[PDB]
Symmetry: C6
C-alpha cells in the first residue's frame, strides 16, 4: 500500500503477512461467496497493482476461476488501450510515460512507476484503483457463475419462519448479475410472490408499500 | 480511520485485518446481542464511511438484517436531505461540495471527499460520526427485533439466587426499545414486582429507596 | 488512549482490537477476581472516558454487576458536582467549559472535549484518571460482593502444606473490603491463629516478629 | 527490508517474526507448490540479500531442493561476473566498490554495503531484486521437478464436471517449464483436445474462438 | 516503557497487551522456574515502576509468593531510606523532589514523577531499573524456596547418558542461592564427584582441567 | 535492537514479545537442529549484547548445552583480551572506555555503553555483531555434538527414491564440523560413492561433472 495524508509523511509499504495470510484464509474457507469481494477490497485498501498481483497469485487451487479473472482483466486492458491511444514520441527527461493496459494490470510496470502514477506531478492516475475495479469486475463474474441457484427459486417453506426465508432470498440476491433497478423490482414483486400462503396473505394486508421491518414484525407470529 | 492529534501528524489509515477480522468473528459468533453494538463502535473509532461500508459489507449471512440496516440508513439519508436542501450552483474552485445523504452513507462519495469533509477548512463535517449514528440506529432496531423476549416476562424462579434473576432482567432490559425514563420506571417497579415471594418481601422491608448493592446484599442468604 | 512524551509528538489513538479483545476474554474467563482489576487498569493506561466506556459496554452478561458499577459511578458524579459547583456564565471564546460529573463519566462529553481537558492550556484536568478511579471503586465493590467467603474462615487443614494455606489466605485477603491497617492486623493475628496445630507451634517458636520467608522455611518439613 | 518513500524517512528494518514464521509455515505445509513462489516474493518485498539469505536458511528439510537452489544461484553469479568484469583498481575514498556475484547473493557483502548499493549516490544497484530474481529462477526449477505430472496427461473424466477438469489442467499448467507462447498454444489446443466426449462436442459447437466463461457456462449442464 | 534514543523522539508507552498477556501466561504455566526471571526482565525492558507494579499485580494465585515479594521490596525500600536521608525543605519551583523507597516501588509516586526521574535535568535517577533490581532479588528468593531439591543430591544414574545428568545438575544449579565462587567450586568438584562409576573414571582420566565439551565427548559412548 | 537508517531517526528498542516468544518456541520444539541457528540470527538482527543475553537466558532446559555456550563465549572473550590489551589510563571526559571481553558478552557493560559502542563518535565497535559471532560459534559446536550421526553412514536404501537419499545426506552435511573445501570434497565423492547400485551406475554414466538437477532428473525413474 501507499499510506495517505493531507499534510503527513507518505510511504510505500508492501502487503503485510497479517493481510496476506488473511486473504489466503478467506479464499481457502469461503470459496466464492459475495463477502469475499468486500474482504478483497478491504484488504486491498491503498494497494498498488503489485500488491494486487501479489494477492491474486498467492491463491492455490481455483485455477479455472483464477484464469477467468485473467481473461476479464485482459479485456479491460484492451478497452483501456483502445480509448487511450499510445503516442509515438520520446518520453523527454522530466516526464513520466503514459501507462497502457498491461502496466496498470501491473504486468508491464515497476513498483516505482506505479508509485509515480499515483503521486505524479499535478495529474494523478490511480492505477491501483483502476486495476482494482477490473479485478472486482472479474470477481463479480466468478461469484455469479459460482452462485448455486437462481433468485426465482427462492420459495418460503410451509413451516419456514419468515426471517429465514428473507435470509435465503437476499443471500441469493447478492450473487445475481442484475442492476439496481432489477433488484428493486425483484425485491417487491418476488419477495411477496414467493412467500408461503400463510404469510403471503398478511403482507398483502399491508398493501403495496411497507418496510421490511414492518413485514418481519408482521410475520413474527407464524 | 483518520488518527487524531492537537499538534501531531494526521493520517488516513484504512481498516486493519486485526480490526476487520475481529468484526467478522463478533458477528459470526454473537449474532445480534447488545454488546455487538459497542464492539462495532469500538472497532469503528475514527472511521470514515468507506471504513463503515467495509465493515458492514463483509458480513455474510444475516442478509434480512443487513437489508433492514440499508432501509434504515436510507431513511436517515432522506431526512438529512429534506433538512439540508441542495443548491443549484457551480462549486467554484477553492470550495468543496456540500455532502448529501448518499455521500455520507459513503455510496456517492470518494475517500478523498470523505477525508476532506472531516478536515475541511474552518467548518468541519464529521460524516463518519454522522453515518455511524445512522448505522447504530439500524442496529438498535435489529437488536430489538432479535430480542427473544419482553421485559415483563422476567420473573425470578422459586429457587433462583437473586443475583441470577438480576442478571436476566438487565440483560433483557438492554435489548428494549424504551427511553431512559421508561427504563428508570421499569427498574424500580418491575424489579421488585417480579422477584420471588421470599425476596419480594425483604426488598419491601428496605422501603422504596435502596441501592442495587443493598438489595443484592439483602437477598444474599436465600 | 493519548500517548505521552516530555518533548515528543502526542496522539489520540482509540482502543486497539488486541486491547479490546483481551479485556473481553479476561471478563469472559476470570469473572470477578481481583487480578481483573489490575488487568483493567493495565489495559486502560492513558485511556479517555470514551475508551473507558468502550471497555465497560463491551461486556456481555454480568448485567447485575455492570449495573452496580453504573450506580457507583453515578454516586461519584454526584459527589464531584456537589464540591464542584457549576457557574451560571457564558463560556467565552478562548475558554473550555468546566466538566461536570457526567462529562467525566464520558456520557455528557465529546472525545474532543475529553481530549482538551487532559491537554488544556495551563491547568490540566485528567478526566480519564478521575473516571478510572470511580470505575475501580465500583469494581472493588463488585469483587468484594463476589468474594465467595470471609477471611476468618481460612483454616489450615491437618495435612495441608503450609504453603497452600498461605496461598488461600492471601487470595481471600485480596478480596476483602478492609484498609491497610486492618490487613496488617489480620496478617499477624490471623495467619498464626488459623494455622494447623503442628505448625501453629513452630511459628510461636519464632516469637511475634518473623518474616513470611522465615515462616514458610520453618514449616517446610510438615 | 528497506521501506520506501518519494519524500519520507527511509529505514533499514530486518525481517519480522510474523514474516519469518509465515515463511517457515508455508514451506512446512505446502512443500513445493507454485503459490509458494508468489508467497516468497510477497514476504520478501523490499528485502536485501541478508533478508533473502535469512528466509532461505531457516528452512529445515528439503535439503536436496535447497542445494539445487544454491547451484542455480551460483550459476547466476558466474554469469553476472562474466558480463561484469571486475577492475584492478583501488576503491578511492568517496566511492563504493562494485558488487560481484557473491556480494549480491549476500555471501560476500555486509548489510551496510547491500544497504548502500540500493541507495548509492546517483547510480542505483538493486541487489535485493537481482538476487531475488536468481532465487525465483531456482525455485521455478524446483517447482518444475516437483510437479507430479505432465500437462498432456490432464484428461477430463467421464463423470467429471467440466469445472473440476479446468481446475486440474490449469493447476498443472502453472507448474510447467514452458513460455507464454507455449502456454497459449496448450490452452486452446489441449483444453478442448483433452475434454470428455460429451463436452468436447459442445466446445467444438462454439467454433475456435470463445472465452473460458462461455465454455464453462456452456458445459454447466453436464 | 520509555523508548530510548541518542537523538530520536523519546516516548512514554504503557505495557502492551502482547507483553502483559505473555507475562500472565509465563507465570500461569512455568510457576517458579529460573527462566521466568529472565522472561520478566525481558518483558520489563525500559519499564517504569507503574509498569512493574502492573506486571506483578496481574498474577492471580501464588499469593504466598507474591506476598514474600512485597516483604522483600519493603526491606529494599527501608535500606534505600536509611542511606538516602530525606530533607526537611520546600521543593522550590524549578526542582523535582527526591524519591523515597515507596516512590521507587511506585506506590507513592505518579507516572509523571517516575517519568521525570528517569529524564530529570542533568542528574538521572533510573527508578525503574532500581525497583526492577529489588523485584529480581525477591524473585530469586522465591525461585530458591521453590527449588524442589539441593544440588548435592544430583547423582548420575547407572544407565544415565552423561548428557542427561549434566542437564539435571545445571538445572538445579541455576536455582541455588550461592555466589559465583561457590558455583565454580561446585562445578568441578561435584560434577565429577557425583557422576556414575563408569564415567567418573574417564573424567578422572582427563586430569583436573578439561572443558565440558571434552567431558561430554569423552562420555558419549556410555 | 537498534533500528538502522542512512538519514532516518535511530532508536534503541528492546526485544519484542513476538520475537522473544518465537525464540522460546523454536528451542522448545526443534532442540538442536541447524535451522535453529539461522532462526537465532534472524531474530537477533540489530541486537545488542543485552538482547542476546536475554534470548539465551530465557531457554529452560538444555542446561548442559547452555553451559557449553558459556564456556565457548568465555574462550572468545579471553582471546579478545589477549589481542586487545587494556590500558592503565583514566578515561578522560569526552571519551568512552574501551570494551573488554566481558563487556562485549554483555556481562560487564550497560545498555547505554553497548548503545554507545555501536554509535561511538567516528570509530564504530559493533559489540552486538561480535558477540553474536561468539554465540553462533558455540551453537555450531553444540549442533555438531547433537548431530545424531556421521556423514559417512548416509547410504541410499535399495528401494530409496534418490530424492530422499539426497535429502538425508545434505541434512547430515549441514550438521558437520568441516570447512567448505571438505564439504565440496564430500559432495562429489561421497554422494555418488554412497548411492544405491541401480543409481550409482547412471550417475557414473554422466561422467564426473554434472549438476544436482541433472542427477535427480537422471534418477527420477527408479
Ligand atoms: Cl500471520
Ligand atoms: Cl505466480
Ligand atoms: Cl420472523
Ligand atoms: Cl442485494
Ligand atoms: Cl423478526
Ligand atoms: Cl488477522
Ligand atoms: Cl458488497
Ligand atoms: Cl444473590
Ligand atoms: Cl439497561
Ligand atoms: Cl451478591
Ligand atoms: Cl484481536
Ligand atoms: Cl451499550
Ligand atoms: Cl511449605
Ligand atoms: Cl492483600
Ligand atoms: Cl516453601
Ligand atoms: Cl510469530
Ligand atoms: Cl545456515
Ligand atoms: Cl462446470
Ligand atoms: Cl498458467
Ligand atoms: Cl461453472
Ligand atoms: Cl494479546
Ligand atoms: Cl491489585
Ligand atoms: Cl552424552
Ligand atoms: Cl548456573
Ligand atoms: Cl553429547
Ligand atoms: Cl506473543
Ligand atoms: Cl538467568
Ligand atoms: Cl528422485
Ligand atoms: Cl551443507
Ligand atoms: Cl526429482
Amino acid at each position: 500500500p501507499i499510506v495517505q495524508n493531507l499534510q503527513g509523511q507518505m510511504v510505500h509499504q508492501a502487503i503485510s503477512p497479517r493481510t496476506l495470510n488473511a486473504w489466503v484464509k478467506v479464499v481457502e474457507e469461503k470459496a466464492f461467496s459475495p463477502e469475499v469481494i468486500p474482504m478483497f477490497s478491504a484488504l486491498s485498501e491503498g494497494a498498488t497493482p503489485q500488491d494486487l498481483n501479489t494477492m491474486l497469485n498467492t491463491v492455490g487451487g481455483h485455477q479455472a476461476a483464477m484464469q477467468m479473472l485473467k481473461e476479464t482483466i485482459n479485456e479491460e486492458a484492451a478497452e483501456w488501450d483502445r480509448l487511450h491511444p499510445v503516442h509515438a514520441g520520446p518520453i523527454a527527461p522530466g516526464q513520466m510515460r503514459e501507462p497502457r493496459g498491461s502496466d496498470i494490470a501491473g504486468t508491464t510496470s515497476t513498483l516505482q512507476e506505479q508509485i509515480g502514477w499515483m503521486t505524479r506531478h499535478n495529474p494523478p492516475i490511480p492505477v491501483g484503483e483502476i486495476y482494482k475495479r477490473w479485478i472486482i469486475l472479474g470477481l463479480n463474474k466468478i461469484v455469479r457463475m459460482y452462485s448455486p441457484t437462481s433468485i426465482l427459486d427462492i420459495r418460503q417453506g410451509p413451516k419456514e419462519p419468515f426471517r429465514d426465508y428473507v435470509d435465503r432470498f437476499y443471500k441469493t440476491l447478492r450473487a445475481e448479475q442484475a442492476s439496481q433497478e432489477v433488484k428493486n423490482w425483484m425485491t417487491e414483486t418476488l419477495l411477496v410472490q414467493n412467500a408461503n400462503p400463510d404469510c403471503k396473505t398478511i403482507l398483502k394486508a399491508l398493501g403495496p408499500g411497507a418496510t421490511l421491518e414492518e413485514m418481519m414484525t408482521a410475520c413474527q407470529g407464524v
